[PDB]
From Swiss-Prot:
UniProt domain B30.2/SPRY: residue ranges: 8-185
Family: Belongs to the TRIM/RBCC family.
Name of the protein in its database record: E3 ubiquitin-protein ligase TRIM21
PTM remark: Autoubiquitinated; does not lead to its proteasomal degradation. Deubiquitinated by USP4; leading to its stabilization. Autoubiquitinated.
Domain description: The coiled-coil is necessary for the cytoplasmic localization. The RING-type zinc finger is necessary for ubiquitination and for the IRF3-driven interferon beta promoter activity. Interacts with SKP2 and CUL1 in a RING finger-independent manner. The RING-type zinc finger is necessary for ubiquitination of NMI.
Compartment(s): Cytoplasm; Cytoplasmic vesicle, Autophagosome; Nucleus; Cytoplasm, P-body
Subunit and partners: Homotrimer. Component of a SCF(SKP2)-like complex containing CUL1, SKP1, TRIM21 and SKP2. Interacts with CALR, CUL1, FBXW11, HSPA5, IKBKB, IRF3, SKP1 and VCP. Interacts with SKP2; the interaction with SKP2 does not depend on an intact F-box domain. Interacts (via N-terminus and C-terminus) with DCP2 (via N-terminus and C-terminus). Interacts (via C-terminus) with IRF8 (via C-terminus). Interacts with ULK1, BECN1 and with ATG8 family members, including GABARAP, GABARAPL1, GABARAPL2 and MAP1LC3C/LC3C. Interacts with TRIM21 and SQSTM1/sequestosome 1. Interacts with IRF3.
Membrane-spanning ranges: none
Induction of synthesis: Up-regulated by IFN.
Top-level taxonomic group: Eukaryota
Annotated gene: Trim21
Signal peptide range: none
Length: 185
């Protein structure tokens, strides 16, 4: 792809984080802690899952960023509406305001309803995410495999400002402690 020139500098919004997440000083990395991280609760925090939003809001234009997923067993990545549900149980779907892909139990899937199987020959260590607001497109790229396309959501109905979306996943196995990292431009 040739989307790299739309690169944006994403930072994580501490106030939206699940209370077990640990965000680095530079707000560019996040991992699952082994306990509650001693923060107050608020209506913005994701309660049920290890999720956090980017601070940046997008309502127009073309945006691109990259995320490092090295040595993770489970994660979700993409964008979501600013007004997505934060509390209780929900599925990641465009009907609920999410445009995402994930790794789970050694398979990759797009967060459609129902979910769509992805075909990845080279397990990615870094994911590129492209958003074209006006066109209604969210695309995912395999940076480890020379930028090959993973998935395109088209005919998106964003219906609000968008925020970068992250889920570091649970670590029940002891094999999923590694962080998500926003990669440098
Ligand atoms: O699991 C990982 N590191 C643990 C992070 C940590 C744990 C405890 C602590 O006190 C401070 C830092 C990892 C990091 C990079 C790639 C893969 N795995």
């Amino acid at each position: 792809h040739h989307h790299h020139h739309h690169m944006v500098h994403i930072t994580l919004d501490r106030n939206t984080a699940n209370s077990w997440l640990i965000i680095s000083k530079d707000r560019r990395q996040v991992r699952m802690g082994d306990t509650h991280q001693n923060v107050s609760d608020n209506k913005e925090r994701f309660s049920n899952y290890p999720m956090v939003l980017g601070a940046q809001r997008f309502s127009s234009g073309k945006m691109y960023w990259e995320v490092d997923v090295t040595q993770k067993e489970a994660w979700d990545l993409g964008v979501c509406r600013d007004s997505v549900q934060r509390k209780g149980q929900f599925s990641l779907s465009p009907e609920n305001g999410f445009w995402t892909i994930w790794l789970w139990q050694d398979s990759y899937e797009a967060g459609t309803s129902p979910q769509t199987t992805l075909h990845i020959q080279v397990p990615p260590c870094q994911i590129g995410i492209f958003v074209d607001y006006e066109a209604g497109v969210v695309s995912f790229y395999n940076i480890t495999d020379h930028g090959s396309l993973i998935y395109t959501f088209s005919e998106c109905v964003f219906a609000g400002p968008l925020r970068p979306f992250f889920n570091v996943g649970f670590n029940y196995s002891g094999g999923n402690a590694a962080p998500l990292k926003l990669c440098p431009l």
